[PDB]
Write a protein that binds this DNA or RNA. Structure first.
Lengths: 21, 317, 292
DNA sequence: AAAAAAA
DNA sequence: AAAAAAAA
């Protein structure tokens, strides 16, 4: 699968949702 | 009643598909628009071969296409679209000959031919908008294998060159990458990856997407975002009474386009490459918010931090 | 008693636009300046063709422009400007012939031709100053497509080649990039993205922007900065009684020509210089957020 | 401020 | 989120 979250509507891109912390 | 673009599209689809063209199914409209885009781009069998500056390998494919028999009447297209016996007449009459350019037609001075080319261009734009919407819709539940890193995701949707030429500001891919890399003129248009595109059943009717529309979650999301956009956008939807399948729109995202967070160095100040990240060291992205404009007013909603595709997958389990 | 620079511009605007030229509207003055600049650069339909070293496509474009019908009296240029019957005579007598060079004019010794060339150059400078101001004003609410990073934002405004040739110290873009990214001479001008340009309604009358004159927030911001400058510059303006989209200038920044957000700018007020803490958000973002 | 001088 | 230009 893919855990990316592209930057949109003023939000910052995330290279991996899980690693965030 | 309807603009020139939508009237042209309705006329074309009706002429080509008889009564088999359902005007209230997004999948059927998308399939019809794809077939029409192929027809008007001379990608179907039996149409003019593209040889102007083609390489021998491309010339092989073009000659094979030209030699191949054209689609026959009654042929099944997609799922529930059937070609009529009069589709050949429409293809011969309403499709500009290969290599046609608006300047030559204007120089000729034929009003009928000018209107024909204008209709062709408007149809191309409408079909490409529907193509981008269908690309987002597919991406909502089907990750593209090509997209593996944010650099690849930056150029969605990966549509052909004709799609880019029709809608440079909505279509991404190889040609958008080339245009961004290459020299940028006054006509350069940046890829608006989350521009609002009404569902095809709305786009052909000319109804602009707004608050209160009876739409499904997947189609609304494909309208306002795509698979890898954040899941907080799902807040722009609300199930109707009794749940069912179709809900209602409670709001729309703000800052859909034209978001710049640069602060150039001026008056002795130091430049900032990104206002959001600058902060002081607290790079907590989960605290970010999106401004959703609702009927009552604009509200700031905390980001979910999870892709729309993943949110939909989790809620479907 | 205005300077010749402004007198020439006013005379040209009058001759070419009749009474339709309103000297109190920034948009009207900007449109008139743009039309005059494209007239004096030989860019209007029916004018001479730039075919000295044009490529095939450029050769064809210039030939089509020459063959195309020239503007006629009554044409609508913008929103509130209508060409008069005198515009042909003005374009014939005041616009120097294509390719003319000041050296040859001075060598010939013709006083009339020398004056015409000097007036043409002064008019070009005035029109380009107005063009830069209008570019800032536009960018206050709608950023250029070419501005994606700081490297791109460093070359605002993206104006044409003639604009740069006229005011190299104010105009940016491709030609400013080329000049900066190349061998530089003694007569080389550095781009000043924040050089103070009075609003056109003030520029064409010689009034120097100063504390205490009635202006609009967008007007002042376009005068002293552009869209991507820090929002603290908004402190240079103050709304009047009832606002009404019209206020007054309370200061003008200096050096126009944790710690990162603690940087301050210097503002010259009626009393003296004061240090104002930066906002951290560009003027574009601040205007978007404060719009409602 | 005077001088100089297109993808 | 109008119109005129205009292929690896």
């Amino acid at each position: 699968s893919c855990f990316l979250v592209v930057a949109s509507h003023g939000l910052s891109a995330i290279a991996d949702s899980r690693i965030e912390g | 009643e309807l603009p020139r673009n939508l009237e042209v599209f309705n006329e074309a689809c009706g002429h080509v598909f008889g009564s088999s063209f359902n005007r209230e199914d997004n999948s059927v409209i998308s399939d019809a628009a794809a077939f029409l885009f192929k027809m008007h781009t001379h990608s179907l069998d039996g149409q003019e071969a593209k040889v102007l500056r083609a390489s021998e390998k491309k010339r092989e494919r073009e000659n094979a296409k030209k030699s191949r028999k054209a689609p026959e009447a009654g042929m099944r297209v997609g799922r529930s679209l059937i070609l009529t016996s009069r589709w050949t007449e429409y293809c011969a009459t309403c499709v500009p000959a290969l290599g046609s350019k608006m300047k030559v037609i204007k120089a000729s001075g034929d009003a009928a031919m000018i209107q024909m080319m204008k209709d062709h261009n408007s149809l191309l734009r409408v079909c490409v908008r529907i193509e981008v919407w269908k690309a987002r819709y597919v991406s909502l539940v089907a990750l593209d294998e090509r997209i593996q890193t944010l650099e690849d995701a930056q150029w969605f949707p990966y549509l052909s060159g004709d799609s880019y030429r029709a809608c440079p500001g909505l279509v991404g891919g190889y040609f958008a990458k080339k245009a961004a890399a290459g020299e940028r003129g006054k006509n350069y248009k940046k890829l608006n990856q989350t521009a609002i595109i009404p569902p095809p059943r709305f786009l052909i009717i000319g109804h602009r997407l707004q608050i209160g529309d009876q739409v499904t979650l997947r189609e609304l999301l494909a309208s306002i975002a795509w698979g890898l956009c954040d899941g907080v956008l799902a807040e722009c939807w609300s199930p109707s009474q009794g749940d069912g399948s179709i809900g209602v729109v409670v709001g729309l995202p703000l800052q859909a386009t034209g978001s710049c967070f640069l602060v150039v160095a001026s008056h002795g100040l130091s430049a900032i490459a990104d206002s959001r990240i600058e902060g002081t060291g607290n790079t907590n992205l989960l605290e970010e918010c999106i401004a959703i404009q609702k009927q009552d007013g604009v509200i700031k909603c905390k980001r979910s931090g999870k892709s729309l595709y993943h949110c939909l997958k989790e809620t479907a389990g």
